[PDB]
Design a protein around this ligand. Sequence first.
Ligand SMILES: *[C@@H]1O[C@H](CO)[C@@H](O[C@@H]2O[C@H](CO)[C@@H](O[C@@H]3O[C@H](CO[C@H]4O[C@H](CO)[C@@H](O)[C@H](O)[C@@H]4O[C@H]4O[C@H](CO)[C@@H](O)[C@H](O)[C@@H]4O)[C@@H](O)[C@H](O[C@H]4O[C@H](CO)[C@@H](O)[C@H](O)[C@@H]4O[C@H]4O[C@H](CO)[C@@H](O)[C@H](O)[C@@H]4O)[C@@H]3O)[C@H](O)[C@H]2NC(C)=O)[C@H](O)[C@H]1NC(C)=O
Ligand SMILES: *[C@@H]1O[C@H](CO)[C@@H](O[C@@H]2O[C@H](CO)[C@@H](O[C@@H]3O[C@H](CO[C@H]4O[C@H](CO)[C@@H](O)[C@H](O)[C@@H]4O[C@H]4O[C@H](CO)[C@@H](O)[C@H](O)[C@@H]4O)[C@@H](O)[C@H](O[C@H]4O[C@H](CO)[C@@H](O)[C@H](O)[C@@H]4O[C@H]4O[C@H](CO)[C@@H](O)[C@H](O)[C@@H]4O)[C@@H]3O)[C@H](O)[C@H]2NC(C)=O)[C@H](O)[C@H]1NC(C)=O
Ligand SMILES: *[C@@H]1O[C@H](CO)[C@@H](O[C@@H]2O[C@H](CO)[C@@H](O[C@@H]3O[C@H](CO[C@H]4O[C@H](CO)[C@@H](O)[C@H](O)[C@@H]4O)[C@@H](O)[C@H](O[C@H]4O[C@H](CO)[C@@H](O)[C@H](O)[C@@H]4O)[C@@H]3O)[C@H](O)[C@H]2NC(C)=O)[C@H](O)[C@H]1NC(C)=O
Ligand SMILES: *[C@@H]1O[C@H](CO)[C@@H](O[C@@H]2O[C@H](CO)[C@@H](O[C@@H]3O[C@H](CO)[C@@H](O)[C@H](O[C@H]4O[C@H](CO)[C@@H](O)[C@H](O)[C@@H]4O)[C@@H]3O)[C@H](O)[C@H]2NC(C)=O)[C@H](O)[C@H]1NC(C)=O
Ligand SMILES: *[C@@H]1O[C@H](CO)[C@@H](O[C@@H]2O[C@H](CO)[C@@H](O[C@@H]3O[C@H](CO)[C@@H](O)[C@H](O[C@H]4O[C@H](CO)[C@@H](O)[C@H](O)[C@@H]4O)[C@@H]3O)[C@H](O)[C@H]2NC(C)=O)[C@H](O)[C@H]1NC(C)=O
Ligand SMILES: CC(=O)N[C@@H]1[C@@H](O)[C@H](O[C@@H]2O[C@H](CO[C@]3(C(=O)O)C[C@H](O)[C@@H](NC(C)=O)[C@H]([C@H](O)[C@H](O)CO)O3)[C@H](O)[C@H](O)[C@H]2O)[C@@H](CO)O[C@H]1O
Ligand SMILES: *[C@@H]1O[C@H](CO)[C@@H](O[C@@H]2O[C@H](CO)[C@@H](O[C@@H]3O[C@H](CO)[C@@H](O)[C@H](O)[C@@H]3O)[C@H](O)[C@H]2NC(C)=O)[C@H](O)[C@H]1NC(C)=O
Ligand SMILES: Nc1nc(=O)c2nc(CNc3ccc(C(=O)N[C@@H](CCC(=O)O)C(=O)O)cc3)cnc2[nH]1
Ligand SMILES: *[C@@H]1O[C@H](CO)[C@@H](O[C@@H]2O[C@H](CO)[C@@H](O)[C@H](O)[C@H]2NC(C)=O)[C@H](O)[C@H]1NC(C)=O
Ligand SMILES: *[C@@H]1O[C@H](CO)[C@@H](O[C@@H]2O[C@H](CO)[C@@H](O)[C@H](O)[C@H]2NC(C)=O)[C@H](O)[C@H]1NC(C)=O
Ligand SMILES: *[C@@H]1O[C@H](CO)[C@@H](O[C@@H]2O[C@H](CO)[C@@H](O)[C@H](O)[C@H]2NC(C)=O)[C@H](O)[C@H]1NC(C)=O
Ligand SMILES: *[C@@H]1O[C@H](CO)[C@@H](O)[C@H](O)[C@H]1NC(C)=O
Ligand SMILES: *[C@@H]1O[C@H](CO)[C@@H](O)[C@H](O)[C@H]1NC(C)=O
Ligand SMILES: *[C@@H]1O[C@H](CO)[C@@H](O)[C@H](O)[C@H]1NC(C)=O
Ligand SMILES: *[C@@H]1O[C@H](CO)[C@@H](O)[C@H](O)[C@H]1NC(C)=O
Ligand SMILES: *[C@@H]1O[C@H](CO)[C@@H](O)[C@H](O)[C@H]1NC(C)=O
Ligand SMILES: *[C@@H]1O[C@H](CO)[C@@H](O)[C@H](O)[C@H]1NC(C)=O
Ligand SMILES: *[C@@H]1O[C@H](CO)[C@@H](O)[C@H](O)[C@H]1NC(C)=O
Lengths: 97, 49, 48, 137, 404, 455, 48
Amino acid sequence: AMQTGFTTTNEAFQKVQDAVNNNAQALSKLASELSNTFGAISASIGDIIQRLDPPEQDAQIDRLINGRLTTLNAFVAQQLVRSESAALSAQLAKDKV
Amino acid sequence: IQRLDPPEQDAQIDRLINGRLTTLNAFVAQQLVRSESAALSAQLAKDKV
Amino acid sequence: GFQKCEQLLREYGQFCSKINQALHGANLRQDDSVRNLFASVKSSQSSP
Amino acid sequence: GFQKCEQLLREYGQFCSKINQALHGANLRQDDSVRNLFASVKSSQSSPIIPGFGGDFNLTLLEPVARSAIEDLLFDKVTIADPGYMQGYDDCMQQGPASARDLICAQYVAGYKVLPPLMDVNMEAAYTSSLLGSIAG
Amino acid sequence: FSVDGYIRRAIDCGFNDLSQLHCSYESFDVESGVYSVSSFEAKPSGSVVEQAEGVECDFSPLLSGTPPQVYNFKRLVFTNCNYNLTKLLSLFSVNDFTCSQISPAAIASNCYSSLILDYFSYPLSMKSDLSVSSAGPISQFNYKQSFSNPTCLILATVPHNLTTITKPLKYSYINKCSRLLSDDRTEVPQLVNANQYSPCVSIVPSTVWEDGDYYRKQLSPLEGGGWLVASGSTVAMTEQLQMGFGITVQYGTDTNSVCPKLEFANDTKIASQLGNCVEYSLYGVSGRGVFQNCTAVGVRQQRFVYDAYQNLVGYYSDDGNYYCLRACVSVPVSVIYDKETKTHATLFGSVACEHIYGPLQTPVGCVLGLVNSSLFVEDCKLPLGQSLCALPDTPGEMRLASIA
Amino acid sequence: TVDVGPDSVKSACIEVDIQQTFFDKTWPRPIDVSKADGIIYPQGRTYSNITITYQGLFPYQGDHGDMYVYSAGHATGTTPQKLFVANYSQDVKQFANGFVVRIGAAANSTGTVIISPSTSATIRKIYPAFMLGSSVGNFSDGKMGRFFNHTLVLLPDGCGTLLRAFYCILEPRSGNHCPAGNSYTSFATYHTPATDCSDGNYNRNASLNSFKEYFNLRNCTFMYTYNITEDEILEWFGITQTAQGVHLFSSRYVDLYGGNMFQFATLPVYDTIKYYSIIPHSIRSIQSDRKAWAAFYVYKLQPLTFLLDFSVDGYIRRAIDCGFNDLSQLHCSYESFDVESGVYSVSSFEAKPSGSVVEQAEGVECDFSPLLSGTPPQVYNFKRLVFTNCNYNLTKLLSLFSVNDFTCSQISPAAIASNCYSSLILDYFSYPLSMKSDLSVSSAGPISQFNYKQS
Amino acid sequence: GFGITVQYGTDTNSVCPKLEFANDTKIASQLGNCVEYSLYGVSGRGVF
Ligand SMILES: *[C@@H]1O[C@H](CO)[C@@H](O[C@@H]2O[C@H](CO)[C@@H](O[C@@H]3O[C@H](CO[C@H]4O[C@H](CO)[C@@H](O)[C@H](O)[C@@H]4O[C@H]4O[C@H](CO)[C@@H](O)[C@H](O)[C@@H]4O)[C@@H](O)[C@H](O[C@H]4O[C@H](CO)[C@@H](O)[C@H](O)[C@@H]4O[C@H]4O[C@H](CO)[C@@H](O)[C@H](O)[C@@H]4O)[C@@H]3O)[C@H](O)[C@H]2NC(C)=O)[C@H](O)[C@H]1NC(C)=O
Ligand SMILES: *[C@@H]1O[C@H](CO)[C@@H](O[C@@H]2O[C@H](CO)[C@@H](O[C@@H]3O[C@H](CO[C@H]4O[C@H](CO)[C@@H](O)[C@H](O)[C@@H]4O[C@H]4O[C@H](CO)[C@@H](O)[C@H](O)[C@@H]4O)[C@@H](O)[C@H](O[C@H]4O[C@H](CO)[C@@H](O)[C@H](O)[C@@H]4O[C@H]4O[C@H](CO)[C@@H](O)[C@H](O)[C@@H]4O)[C@@H]3O)[C@H](O)[C@H]2NC(C)=O)[C@H](O)[C@H]1NC(C)=O
Ligand SMILES: *[C@@H]1O[C@H](CO)[C@@H](O[C@@H]2O[C@H](CO)[C@@H](O[C@@H]3O[C@H](CO[C@H]4O[C@H](CO)[C@@H](O)[C@H](O)[C@@H]4O)[C@@H](O)[C@H](O[C@H]4O[C@H](CO)[C@@H](O)[C@H](O)[C@@H]4O)[C@@H]3O)[C@H](O)[C@H]2NC(C)=O)[C@H](O)[C@H]1NC(C)=O
Ligand SMILES: *[C@@H]1O[C@H](CO)[C@@H](O[C@@H]2O[C@H](CO)[C@@H](O[C@@H]3O[C@H](CO)[C@@H](O)[C@H](O[C@H]4O[C@H](CO)[C@@H](O)[C@H](O)[C@@H]4O)[C@@H]3O)[C@H](O)[C@H]2NC(C)=O)[C@H](O)[C@H]1NC(C)=O
Ligand SMILES: *[C@@H]1O[C@H](CO)[C@@H](O[C@@H]2O[C@H](CO)[C@@H](O[C@@H]3O[C@H](CO)[C@@H](O)[C@H](O[C@H]4O[C@H](CO)[C@@H](O)[C@H](O)[C@@H]4O)[C@@H]3O)[C@H](O)[C@H]2NC(C)=O)[C@H](O)[C@H]1NC(C)=O
Ligand SMILES: CC(=O)N[C@@H]1[C@@H](O)[C@H](O[C@@H]2O[C@H](CO[C@]3(C(=O)O)C[C@H](O)[C@@H](NC(C)=O)[C@H]([C@H](O)[C@H](O)CO)O3)[C@H](O)[C@H](O)[C@H]2O)[C@@H](CO)O[C@H]1O
Ligand SMILES: *[C@@H]1O[C@H](CO)[C@@H](O[C@@H]2O[C@H](CO)[C@@H](O[C@@H]3O[C@H](CO)[C@@H](O)[C@H](O)[C@@H]3O)[C@H](O)[C@H]2NC(C)=O)[C@H](O)[C@H]1NC(C)=O
Ligand SMILES: Nc1nc(=O)c2nc(CNc3ccc(C(=O)N[C@@H](CCC(=O)O)C(=O)O)cc3)cnc2[nH]1
Ligand SMILES: *[C@@H]1O[C@H](CO)[C@@H](O[C@@H]2O[C@H](CO)[C@@H](O)[C@H](O)[C@H]2NC(C)=O)[C@H](O)[C@H]1NC(C)=O
Ligand SMILES: *[C@@H]1O[C@H](CO)[C@@H](O[C@@H]2O[C@H](CO)[C@@H](O)[C@H](O)[C@H]2NC(C)=O)[C@H](O)[C@H]1NC(C)=O
Ligand SMILES: *[C@@H]1O[C@H](CO)[C@@H](O[C@@H]2O[C@H](CO)[C@@H](O)[C@H](O)[C@H]2NC(C)=O)[C@H](O)[C@H]1NC(C)=O
Ligand SMILES: *[C@@H]1O[C@H](CO)[C@@H](O)[C@H](O)[C@H]1NC(C)=O
Ligand SMILES: *[C@@H]1O[C@H](CO)[C@@H](O)[C@H](O)[C@H]1NC(C)=O
Ligand SMILES: *[C@@H]1O[C@H](CO)[C@@H](O)[C@H](O)[C@H]1NC(C)=O
Ligand SMILES: *[C@@H]1O[C@H](CO)[C@@H](O)[C@H](O)[C@H]1NC(C)=O
Ligand SMILES: *[C@@H]1O[C@H](CO)[C@@H](O)[C@H](O)[C@H]1NC(C)=O
Ligand SMILES: *[C@@H]1O[C@H](CO)[C@@H](O)[C@H](O)[C@H]1NC(C)=O
Ligand SMILES: *[C@@H]1O[C@H](CO)[C@@H](O)[C@H](O)[C@H]1NC(C)=O
């Protein structure tokens, strides 16, 4: 009866897909955040350099840095949360076996 | 908005945005920590019952 | 509700989509946690 | 790769060292978690799985086809992007991204890398196959 | 640094991947393990450039007849043309040329979607009234520059021999512009918006006759009713006409077709550099990448094809071809290091060795520094992924071992 | 200026019969964003096979817009008579951010001849005519619809083969039935198919010439024409205005069958368009050859966020108006047309102001008189007037002096003269203008170091 | 020279441009409604 069970009504099966989706979400933060300007004139450092002189160029690059540093800190914080959770879960798996 | 023109108005609004975005990120990070903890705890409750 | 702010907020990407989705998932987690917990407290047979 | 940016980045301290070390530790954690988990699934003694294993009890679903039939079905039904561990760098150049928001090809563009797991598929299959054969005894 | 302060030992942190590792831990001794380090960057092998090439942008109107007063400034909008600011600047004695939200070097060298030139008569004695910080009559009722787009302001004097520009009798401006509401108690100042004309322009004559002239229009109900009123003022004319020129530039509403002229080499074509990593500048759009010949997608007329993360991923060229644009892609690097032997190997994860004993292709990428051993281990300290392990020779080269 | 041909030499205009009842039809065609109605394609780029949100000028989902329909004029057999129009010239609308127009939607359907409700005919596409400008008011007899100064006129001509765009001053003619003359009702344009729409040589000035009967065109700065290939295909037209001028959009030169609008022209119109109206048009058909003309619909644009579905070929075929309803907000937040089932929180339904309340100190004027009497102090002995609990007016003080330099810091220019304050402190002193720069914040000279420094 | 310094909140912001008041901008006449307000320089939206 279980051979045809990997469907929409199988909660365990969705948990498998969700674990997969969580990995994808973690990567989407890095892929999607580089397009943000975080108040800057461009998400491109090259555009900032090409358009502005150092006293203003600096401020614009710095906005991009702050946004990207923030993104990476958030990413890392989640990889640590997710790896801690997975490790606890792994010990549960150990006990079940 | 009432006091400043766009080149400065922008900078001031942006400070408020950064602070509020930061606040919401902190909030969400904690709701995720607290919900993860509560979920583990719920499984402990399950075992005790 | 200020349009100037919203205009500047857009330059931070889909910030609010992330806030909403993160909380939506976090909230579903309790409904699932509760449903699972009670499914297990539930008795098959019981005396009045 | 912009030098002006790198020059400004330095004023934030060893930011990138912290990012790398935090992730390195987080990644070691899974290799340790996996190693420990499998060390415990591992059987000391086990019977061979032969076709017909189970007797009147139909276990063909679980017998290795090598992954078992249910195991392959479980993987086939879950949508997982292929990380390209052996040559993904090239797949993303000669074919390009599979779709919008392709997070595997984004790696070589954005600056991030997906690392391979500690054990290959056949080894993990070997562990659960030996586990199956150990259950009755 | 030794106790006595001298430097006796150092690491060049960009020499190799092993050196990068030592620097990231700020130590000459790091533990054994497999570590990710900075990728091996692809570098440009050339460049491709496409710019609109053709008609000069025409500043002739500017040079013929009497320039307008500041509240009636005339606007020349330049699109799809080759600009040269020197060509215009060289005709005037420039008194003050400044830029905002764009560098000086950039105003004369970047490509734009459009360049908008606003010209008018303007006394130099009122120079400061055009400042962003100004609260005087020019910035409040006559002319205001954009706060959103980069702008420049040029104040210049017409030379005695530039006989094609004639002078007005006097310089003039609006010193008051307001609406009287239907109640006739409330008066509301009508401030000029950036890049727009004052609402009082329709009531104020092209030249104010005399300082203090008061103007009034009865507004219709569709205009809100009441009266629009204004007052003019004048400045005595100078020996040489003084003129202001506002320049506003936009960077991405269209193809950035307003460019300096460029003499093109035929080694900057896309077709001649397919498959290479090149720097590009295509109608003001720039970055690094690899062009490939491929099937057209998107709307041709729009030229630049973007993905869902707003990266440029394709381009319709003026040579008739559509190219896919891929990022120059970096090559992943992991350092396999053994502290006891002081040896290492380099893993290029996900990379075929065609891009790199020679290199060894493994299930996790291309690895240099390892020798294939057909040996099994259980006791793996330097796992590579899948079921592979680096095994030090102990020193010799690390062996590639499989986990049993 | 541009020569736009000769003035009309007629002493009278054709009489115009305005009977709005006949044009009060209900043929609703609201914007269907899911079918991508009314969408102007993102201008500087294209996308392929993706779904993204985008900020830009779009019509609202469900907007019915304003329907306008042109008709046949009055006739008696083979001799066309009086023009028959709707009250359109007097119906002046606020331009705001511009508009899009649905043109020919009913083509090929059987419709009605407006002038004769019992008469049916196949519906044919007709192009809208527009009058746009900065200022409006009335004509000599008090009727509205007069535009002042330069007016932008978008007038299709050649029996629908060209769009003529011009910016000019419209000087009402004084002849019979003309706007500055006797018995005026409404101006209108017209063409006479019998002589203007020959199979070969269409009269490319037929509508221009009728326009000219009501107005003299003066100080034209431009007159441009665009060609239209004839068909009965539904098309969209749009108009917006930026610092670069007036932008004319159309679906027919890029996405004819699809409907997405692309820019085809920019006009050098720099004054702000505030008002527009539809120029009524009446076709001087014979009684025996009346056609049904398709209604056009005008929809207003606003800065909305839409979810846009770009096909492989780059056209937008489907979209979501992210502010239409809560369900739409959901789709936009996930940037998808398909989201999973569930209960989701979305933006709250905002309470909006129903009015305003204001309380201000009202009373004594703040007194700047001291300032005006006697010898002002030197810069190091500046005198201070502190104003509290009073009504201020800076113009009252500024108007007494020839101001050489008035600048503000950490407050806008508009704000200094309009906001309320706890206090206003005015420091006045004698000061040579030759030392102007010594009062700068960045200055290291004697005034800023030893005499006077601002907060 | 004339220096002008303004302060925004040490007291009631009672230094204002003069305003002609309508009697539909009174608080008592709009109780229970959401209104914009400006009270001696203090502003925002709310219900009185
Ligand atoms: C953007 O817009 C700006 C402005 O329009 C452009 O800048 C201009 O660029 C042109 C070149 O394209 C440049 O012309 C050069 O001028 C110099 C100056 O000579 C003048 O003084 C000498 C004094 O001895 C006179 O003998 C000479 O006739 C000139 O006199 C001028 O003024 C007097 C009044 O005082 C008038 O009576 C004169 O008629 C005249 O107006 C020239 O020396 C230079 O000549 C060289 O190039 C020309 C090219 O045609 C060539 O024919 C000559 O033989 C000579 O070339 C040789 O020498 C060069 C090295 O210099 C070497 O490279 C060659 O191989 C040869 O061996 C030329 O005529 C003009 O001055 C610039 N103006 C400004 C304001 O900058 C700019 O280019 C535009 N940008 C773009 C991208 O298009
Ligand atoms: C802040 O402080 C500033 C400065 O103090 C205030 O701004 C002032 O506001 C007053 C109004 O309250 C305004 O007065 C108006 O002046 C115009 C200009 O007229 C002058 O020129 C004409 C030329 O034909 C002369 O005929 C006229 O006499 C004036 O001449 C002046 O100068 C000469 C020397 O050259 C002197 O010899 C003269 O004596 C004189 O000083 C007037 O046209 C305007 O008149 C209208 O309003 C008055 C109200 O009393 C009314 O009686 C008139 O009949 C007329 O009203 C009709 O027309 C209006 C439309 O305009 C319509 O709405 C009405 O219904 C009627 O149909 C009036 O006198 C003064 O100029 C402003 N000054 C500055 C510098 O801005 C500001 O208001 C203060 N803010 C607050 C909130 O209080
Ligand atoms: C009033 O009546 C007229 C006709 O009497 C309608 O006009 C027709 O409208 C349809 C739909 O807009 C047009 O059909 C389209 O034709 C395109 C090209 O047709 C030209 O080229 C093809 C070969 O490529 C020829 O076979 C054809 O005969 C033409 O020479 C096609 O490219 C379009 O297909 C595209 O869109 C469809 C979806 O609509 C996609 O499925 C396709 O894959 C492709 O993307 C489409 O077939 C038709 O040609 C028009 N007729 C004329 C004479 O032009 C009016 O629209 C109707 N008016 C109203 C208001 O209803
Ligand atoms: C923008 O358009 C407006 C509207 O068309 C235009 O304003 C008009 O200006 C003209 C002149 O510039 C005015 O026409 C005449 O001007 C003379 C000047 O000497 C007056 O003497 C005339 O007065 C007659 O009409 C009066 C009416 O009350 C009589 O009282 C008087 O005795 C005379 O009979 C007349 O004003 C024209 O009237 C105004 N129109 C309006 C509606 O105000 C404006 O100039 C244009 N702007 C620009 C910048 O081009
Ligand atoms: C139908 O509408 C069109 C608008 O699309 C209108 O077109 C105009 O035609 C006139 C001529 O009839 C053009 O004016 C000419 O342009 C040329 C350009 O080189 C000039 O050289 C001509 O100058 C000679 O003739 C003048 C006549 O007064 C003399 O004064 C002058 O000294 C020269 O001798 C003349 O300016 C005009 O440019 C076009 N306009 C546009 C916008 O294209 C057409 O006339 C209308 N037809 C009818 C019958 O009304
Ligand atoms: C309004 C009405 O009924 N008038 C009577 C006329 O109908 C009648 O003459 C007949 O008119 C017929 C056409 O009638 C309409 C029409 O529907 O075509 C009636 C319309 O309401 C009117 N439209 C408008 C906007 O006024 C329209 C129009 O006047 C004409 O088209 C003129 O160009 O006429 C048809 O032509 C018959 O053939 C004709 O005999 C006359 C008596 O002759 O009396 C009127 O009171
Ligand atoms: C033990 O259980 C397995 C299933 O768990 C039984 O094998 C299954 O037998 C059925 C026969 O009814 C096969 O059905 C076939 O499916 C194909 C699919 O395309 C169809 O084309 C055929 O016409 C037929 O319907 C089914 O696939 C097969 N499954 C597997 C995994 O082999 C097996 O027979 C049981 N053993 C005993 C001893 O009962
Ligand atoms: N001269 C002329 N011009 C026309 O454009 C014209 N159009 C019609 C038909 N117009 C229409 C337009 C819409 C619907 C219609 O089916 N509307 C829907 C509601 C659509 C909605 O509101 O979502 C309906 O059920 O009525 C019918 C007829 C008839 N005679 C004409 N005659
Ligand atoms: C346009 O995008 C769709 C995705 O929405 C592509 O359809 C996918 O194609 C891949 C090809 O391997 C399949 O594996 C997916 O399952 C398909 N997804 C869906 C939802 O059908 C489509 O092929 C793209 N079109 C082009 C020309 O690239
Ligand atoms: C419109 O154009 C005319 C001519 O180019 C301008 O000049 C006036 O033309 C009339 C013609 O009868 C003369 O009587 C006037 O004396 C001319 N005035 C001047 C100052 O030369 C007219 O000014 C233009 N109008 C606008 C609003 O630009
Ligand atoms: C718009 O259409 C008109 C009419 O077809 C074109 O004008 C014709 O151009 C041809 C070119 O050989 C001439 O032979 C005709 O005599 C012209 N006709 C008229 C009435 O003048 C016009 O060029 C088209 N415009 C564009 C931009 O293509
Ligand atoms: C104008 O041209 C004449 C021609 O001889 C010359 O002498 C004079 O100096 C020139 N003036 C200026 C200002 O260049
Ligand atoms: C490429 O540039 C060289 C430079 O001299 C020229 O000789 C050659 O003809 C050019 N090739 C083409 C195709 O124009
Ligand atoms: C690109 O490919 C098309 C067909 O795939 C071909 O005909 C065209 O010539 C190619 N262009 C280049 C620059 O190779
Ligand atoms: C090492 O050599 C053996 C030869 O027996 C081969 O089977 C194996 O695949 C090789 N490994 C690699 C990574 O090339
Ligand atoms: C014109 O007619 C319409 C529709 O009947 C009505 O709403 C509008 O107010 C009328 N306008 C004028 C100016 O009469
Ligand atoms: C508008 O109407 C009034 C009376 O109806 C008349 O006095 C006035 O002159 C009209 N305006 C114009 C521009 O004709
Ligand atoms: C409210 O304002 C109107 C405006 O005319 C006035 O007539 C009425 O008397 C005012 N009411 C009070 C209480 O002052």
